[PDB]
Design a protein around this nucleic acid. Structure first.
Lengths: 79, 174, 42, 190, 108, 203, 141, 196, 62
RNA sequence: AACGCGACGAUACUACCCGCACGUUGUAGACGUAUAAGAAUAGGCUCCGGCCUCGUAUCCUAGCAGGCGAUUCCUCCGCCGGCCUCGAAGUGGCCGUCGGUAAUUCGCGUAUUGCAAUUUAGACACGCGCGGGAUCAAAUCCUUUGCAGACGACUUAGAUGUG
RNA sequence: CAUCGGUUCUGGCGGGGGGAUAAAGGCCCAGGGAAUGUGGCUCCUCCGGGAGUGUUAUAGCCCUGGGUGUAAUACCCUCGC
């Protein structure tokens, strides 16, 4: 495009008070609306979220798993 | 997230007639002061063991100082951070002289690279890498290289901002 | 002289190497040992 | 990620003299001299070995590290130009109107001038002025061939592209009208 | 003969009144002392008397030159600017004019 | 920080806005400023960005009459720097007009500023401010591309000025050589007590 | 093959390199933490040149031309002091032009009013001798 | 461009001295009388020094020439004086050329030649104050249009709340400066020829 | 139609100027210059050979 | 550009220029109001030995606001004149005369402004004066013109003539 | 100008207490270990330096325990001048 030699009308980054108030009002209304939809939401949700786990690049993951086995065997023996 | 210290915070549930000797829970908290350390402690036990502040007490708060603050160390930090997608695991490495310095650099790094605030970051593990072969990231592997040496090209000289005018043009070679 | 043909016809171009800016940080033997540890932990 | 150190090496033949000062590379050989100002790229030049030129970038990004490959290839092309030279062979083909190509050497400027006439029967005379240091010869071994030779690969290939682009068939079906001048071979003089 | 000068004062410039973004207060002036670039250097000049010397039209009591006297009260900001209080506020036209900071009252 | 009669500033190698800020602050503090070689000032970024901004500036004009009230577009580099300075000073006030009367801007170095000390401002120097690899342009190149007519005249005048400066520098090097020889010769005939007294005092 | 290269030869941050800090003290580099920070130690007997062991930002330091040879990486204060006294870092630092400039600065800063008057008079006498020498030299050619 | 110096000839005609006056009939006609004496004092040292200043410092050299208006049938006696640029050669060549041409008449056929295309510069015929119909060529309004029909119906039906500079208005017509190019010379006739 | 500012029209005009109108204008200039040249030919301080000084400000008043 | 600039011609007076004689004359603001390399910044400077973070430098800097007289020194400064030189908005270099001058040392004076009160001190511009040197001009109204024109404005002419 | 009173801004100095009776660290004593392996040895070389071996030698480092030691210093609190 010939933008450099012949630029067009600039787009103003200067806001207006009416537009700011309207945007704030519509944002608050959308927040209330999504709160209502979250209250009336029919979607199934798990009681416990799926935990991501231990990263593979962590160097001490294997010794941490060794520990985790040690506390599970210790708890099984204590119980 | 500021000048932090590592605190050992031990707390418990208040003793009752049924349970006269309740169990004690210890955590390591990176916090600017003791009030924030105890608040974060009660936050984490509210999230984990369903123990509240009103029904519990703090048994001990101690400062964990670094054993060798004058030794350069490599630190691996396993963390989880919350974004608009959800919770993500990250493993990162920091070459520092103390655990608190590593955690401060971690907080600044996540703020710079992912816009994650203090409230959305959970520090799950901070470890010192015992061996050089334990280093995973290239930006620490280049620093632990044998016979490391480099120059400093294009150094801007320190000139006082109150000295407005100079009679000679500065050089960037030393 | 060169024995092969270059596809774009610029026969003066040298035999380029792979762009590996992180080359030389780790060794092959250490990477093999880390492969073994990684497979066992997985 | 910023890499602490990155290194490139350029081998230099024995009959070549290379002088680098303030990133201005001057390469001298049997066929003459070439000169290139490379001060737009942050690079440290050194003599790492007898006959090897070393290129260093310190604390550079991936883009800054990758620019060293371009610098390496440019200097190697300068060396190849002053040792073996560069040669582009172009062929002009026609269907009905023979393309008349005249090659002269201008006296006051020292550059070659190529005049093209009767391109698809046109009465205009196309004239292309070569870059300095580029010699153009009408070939005698083969039919309807020009040979552009020199030390600068940039100059030789740009002159070849200028000759190719001045003879464009316009507003005609290019599947049917095959007339033009095209680069046929690229290589070294020696 | 002597080729030296006779200056026993430090040069300063009258920058502005004490002000916010919009409201100004003429009762306090801001002075830039020459060679003073920090609060530690400005602390030397606290309490030093400062004169604004100007010229009038009429000759009154043998002189055309009038003086307004004041003192340096406290440092201002971090860059060595000081606050000064005069008997009358300095003229608004003198923003950018020169003032003389004396070496008295001396505590050396 | 020191007060001077006038500060002559070499405009070569300086970033336009930062130099304008420092010069405007000095003018409002009461310091006289002369800027020379405004055609060698720098703007950070690509040249086409400065070119686009100047063309967007050139778009603006009073619709009903372009001879009054409109943005009058000055194409010379000294006037571009002057506009940058003026936009940073309350120029519709008497104090701002007084601060603007303490400034002079020129293309090249007209006499007698060619035999005066030209200062630099490190807070606006491009080699000290811009990151390596970042792009920059020239105000003189921008001016020539938007309609300044005197780039070649200024270039020839600067060539003659630099030849005369080279001759003066040869004389200066000769004078420095004789001054060093004179100090070495007078080192013998100076009283030794005076010598270690000055050495212990630090000169 | 004739190769002539004129480029920039910076000083290198490395183990054994001595840094001058902003307060005039010295410190040998023991560990390179990153490209912006190092670990340093100044075990000098002179209190002005001494530096406690700690992290030194490279933006706040300058590279001196003194490198302690074969200084081990990670060496503690005793071994660094032994290498420092064996290499004689203080004497070479005193012989450098930076310390002479600093000494001149302190001598000029320590002058009193009587000292400045005596300096002016002695400089006028030396200037008279230098002016006679310069007149003799310029008269020759 | 900046005029550095001007060098005049020793003797100037009365018809060109009339150019420097408004009331020549009342005047003492003292123009250039003190200037004529520097051709005599010091063997013209000031004139020569100004000539060398032009030779060594200047890039553009123009002669000053005036018409011989007395040979025309005009009642005007004050002649017209203009700067004519010397092109070609070096600056010293131009200066020696002008020095050689001082106090000399130059005929039209040594500057222009038959079959040459030239440009003509003049002020046009004056018309005084003229309405839009003849000043700009606007369409006339219909017959018996109220408040005039040799006018423009709308001078600004749209925003801005101003009359724009591009709208046609009644005003001065003619007496404009014009440069018209590419005019062919068909004959340069000589006044001494009785059959030109 | 190709405009008067078109590049090809400019190149055509430049070739016409260089090859056709140029020699004619040069010969006319030689003749006219010869005629007008025929008409034209028909101490340093005290002599004026050394150029001494003739018999708003750029600086601030000081 | 009617508040941008240059060259040139003639300039009557109270006009112009030179000297000193000062301002109840003014000026966004004197007080050592001292200081010319160019160029690069992933490189430069040089006396060719070396040197470069750094103007925290260099020059200047003492005497009644700076006297008088010596001892002593040939150093520094200023006005004029000659020869060169300097055009981006024009000025420096050398030489010569004259005048001043602690680099060293000493003698006589400083008081009383009374315990501080701008240290009235500089430059430019303007003005009033003398004593001299230099120079004797234009414009407008008016009459006229029609290449012009609502009116002003514009092109012309009006002093002896090609009126 | 001096000596005071009220309010307040700012600079420095002398003490006390706490914590892992700071953590470090220096100098010693006793163990243990490794490499970004010092010296030595072997093999390559562009003779510049690489590769391998192995635990202090012709450098050093890391971990634990103990002494000096109620050490110093930081940080926090506090008594004054």
């Amino acid at each position: 495009a010939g933008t450099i030699n012949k630029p067009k009308k600039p787009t103003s980054k200067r806001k207006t008070t009416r537009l700011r108030a309207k945007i704030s009002k519509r944002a608050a209304e959308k927040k209330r609306k999504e709160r209502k939809l979250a209250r009336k939401n029919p979607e199934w949700r798990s009681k416990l979220k799926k935990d991501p786990g231990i990263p593979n690049l962590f160097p001490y993951k294997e010794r941490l798993l060794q520990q985790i086995e040690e506390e599970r065997i210790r708890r099984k023996e204590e119980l | 997230m500021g000048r932090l210290q590592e605190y050992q915070v031990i707390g418990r549930h208040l003793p009752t007639e049924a349970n006269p000797n309740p169990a004690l829970y210890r955590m390591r908290i990176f916090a600017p002061n003791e009030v924030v350390a105890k608040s974060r402690f009660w936050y984490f036990l509210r999230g984990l063991k369903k123990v509240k502040k009103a029904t519990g007490e703090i048994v001990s708060v101690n400062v964990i100082s670094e054993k060798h603050p004058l030794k350069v160390k490599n630190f691996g930090i396993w963390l989880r951070y919350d974004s608009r997608s959800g919770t993500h695991n990250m493993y990162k490495e920091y070459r520092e002289t103390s655990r608190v310095a590593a955690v401060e650099a971690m907080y600044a790094d996540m703020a710079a690279r992912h816009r994650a605030r203090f409230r959305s970051i959970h520090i799950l593990k901070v470890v010192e890498l015992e061996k050089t072969e334990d280093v995973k990231r290239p930006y620490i592997k280049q620093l632990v290289a044998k016979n490391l040496s480099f120059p400093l090209p294009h150094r801007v000289p320190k000139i006082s901002t109150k000295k407005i005018f100079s009679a000679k043009r500065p050089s960037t070679f030393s | 002289k060169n024995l092969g043909m270059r596809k774009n016809g610029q026969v003066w171009l040298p035999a380029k190497k792979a762009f590996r800016p992180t080359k030389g940080l780790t060794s092959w033997e250490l990477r093999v040992k880390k492969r073994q540890e990684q497979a066992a932990m997985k | 990620m910023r890499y602490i150190h990155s290194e490139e090496t350029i081998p230099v033949p024995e009959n070549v003299k290379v002088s680098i000062k303030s990133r201005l590379v001057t390469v001298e050989g049997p066929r003459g001299k070439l000169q290139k100002d490379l001060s737009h790229i942050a690079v440290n030049f050194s003599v790492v070995k007898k006959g090897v030129i070393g290129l260093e970038i310190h604390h550079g990004s991936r883009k800054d590290v990758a620019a060293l490959r371009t610098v390496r290839t440019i200097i190697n092309n300068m060396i190849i130009g002053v040792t073996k030279g560069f040669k582009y062979k172009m062929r002009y083909v026609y269907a009905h109107f023979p393309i008349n190509v005249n090659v002269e050497k201008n006296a006051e400027t020292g550059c070659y001038e190529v005049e093209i006439r009767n391109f698809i029967g046109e009465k205009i005379v196309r004239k292309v002025v070569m870059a300095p240091g580029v010699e153009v010869e009408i070939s005698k071994a083969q039919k309807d061939e020009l040979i552009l030779s020199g030390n600068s690969l940039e100059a030789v290939s740009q002159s070849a592209a200028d000759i190719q682009q001045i003879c464009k068939v316009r507003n005609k079906d290019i599947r049917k009208f095959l007339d033009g001048i095209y680069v046929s071979e690229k290589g070294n003089i020696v | 003969p002597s080729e030296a000068g006779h200056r026993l004062y430090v040069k300063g410039r009258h920058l502005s009144y004490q002000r916010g973004r919009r409201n100004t207060h003429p009762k306090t002036s801001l002075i830039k002392i020459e060679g003073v670039d920090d609060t530690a250097a400005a602390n030397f000049y606290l309490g030093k008397r400062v004169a604004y010397v100007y010229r009038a039209q009429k000759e009154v009591r043998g002189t055309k030159i009038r003086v307004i006297w004041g003192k340096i009260t406290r440092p201002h900001g971090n860059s060595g600017v000081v606050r000064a209080k005069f008997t009358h506020p300095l003229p608004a036209r003198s923003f950018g004019a020169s003032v003389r900071i004396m070496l008295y009252p001396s505590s050396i | 920080s020191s007060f001077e009669s006038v500060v002559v500033i070499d405009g070569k190698g300086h970033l336009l806005g930062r130099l304008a800020s420092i010069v405007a602050k000095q003018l409002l503090s009461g310091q006289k400023i002369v800027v020379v070689r405004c055609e060698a000032l720098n703007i950070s970024g690509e040249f086409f960005r400065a070119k686009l901004k100047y063309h967007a500036y050139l778009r603006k004009m009073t619709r009903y009459n372009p001879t009054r009230g409109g943005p009058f577009h000055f194409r010379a580099p000294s006037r571009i720097f002057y506009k940058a300075v003026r936009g940073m000073i309350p120029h519709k006030t008497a104090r701002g007009a007084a601060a603007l009367e303490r400034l002079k801007v020129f293309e090249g170095v007209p006499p007698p500023y060619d035999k005066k000390k030209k200062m630099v401002v490190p807070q606006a120097l491009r080699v000290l401010r811009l990151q390596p690899g970042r792009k920059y342009c020239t105000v003189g190149r921008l001016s020539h591309e938007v309609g300044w007519k005197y780039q070649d005249v200024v270039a020839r005048l600067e060539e003659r000025r630099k030849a005369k400066g080279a001759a003066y520098y040869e004389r200066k090097k000769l004078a420095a050589r004789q001054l060093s020889e004179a100090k070495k010769a007078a080192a013998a005939k100076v009283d030794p007590k005076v010598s270690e007294a000055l050495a212990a005092y630090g000169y | 093959a004739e190769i002539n290269v004129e480029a920039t030869s910076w000083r290198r941050v490395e183990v054994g390199r001595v840094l001058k800090l902003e307060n005039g003290s010295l410190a040998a580099i023991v560990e390179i933490i990153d490209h912006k920070r190092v670990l340093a130690d100044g075990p000098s007997s002179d209190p002005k040149l001494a530096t406690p062991r700690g992290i030194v930002p490279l933006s706040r330091a300058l590279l001196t031309p003194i490198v302690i040879p074969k200084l081990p990486r990670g060496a503690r204060t005793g071994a660094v002091k032994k290498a420092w006294e064996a290499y004689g870092v203080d004497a070479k630092w005193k012989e450098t032009n930076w310390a002479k400039k600093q000494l001149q600065q302190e001598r000029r800063q320590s002058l009193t009013d009587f000292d400045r008057f005596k300096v002016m008079r002695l400089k006028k006498q030396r200037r008279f001798e230098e002016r006679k020498a310069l007149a003799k030299i310029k008269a020759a050619a | 461009l900046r005029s550095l110096t001007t060098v005049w000839a020793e003797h100037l005609s009365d018809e060109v001295k009339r150019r420097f006056y408004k009331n020549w009939y009342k005047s003492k006609k003292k123009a250039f009388t003190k200037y004529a004496k520097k051709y005599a004092e010091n063997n013209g040292a000031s004139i020569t020094r100004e000539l060398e200043r032009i030779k060594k410092y200047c890039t553009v050299v123009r002669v000053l020439a005036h018409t011989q208006i007395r040979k025309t049938p005009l009642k005007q006696k004050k002649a017209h004086l203009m700067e004519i640029q010397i092109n070609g050669g070096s600056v010293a060549d131009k200066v020696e050329f002008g020095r050689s041409l001082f106090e000399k008449p130059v005929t039209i056929d040594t500057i222009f030649e038959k079959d040459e295309m030239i440009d003509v510069i003049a002020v046009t015929k004056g018309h005084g104050f003229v309405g839009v119909t003849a000043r700009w060529g606007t369409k006339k309004l219909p017959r018996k249009t109220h408040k005039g029909l040799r006018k423009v119906a709308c001078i600004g039906a749209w925003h801005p709340s101003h009359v724009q500079w591009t709208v046609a208005r009644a005003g001065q017509m003619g007496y404009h400066h014009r440069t018209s190019v590419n005019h062919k010379i068909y004959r340069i006739g000589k006044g001494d020829d009785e059959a030109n | 139609a190709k405009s008067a500012r078109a590049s090809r029209i400019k190149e055509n005009h430049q070739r016409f100027k260089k090859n056709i109108a140029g020699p004619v204008e040069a010969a006319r200039l030689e003749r006219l210059s010869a005629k007008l040249m025929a008409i034209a030919q028909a101490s340093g301080v005290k002599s004026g050979k050394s150029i001494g000084r003739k018999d708003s400000s750029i600086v601030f008043p000081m």
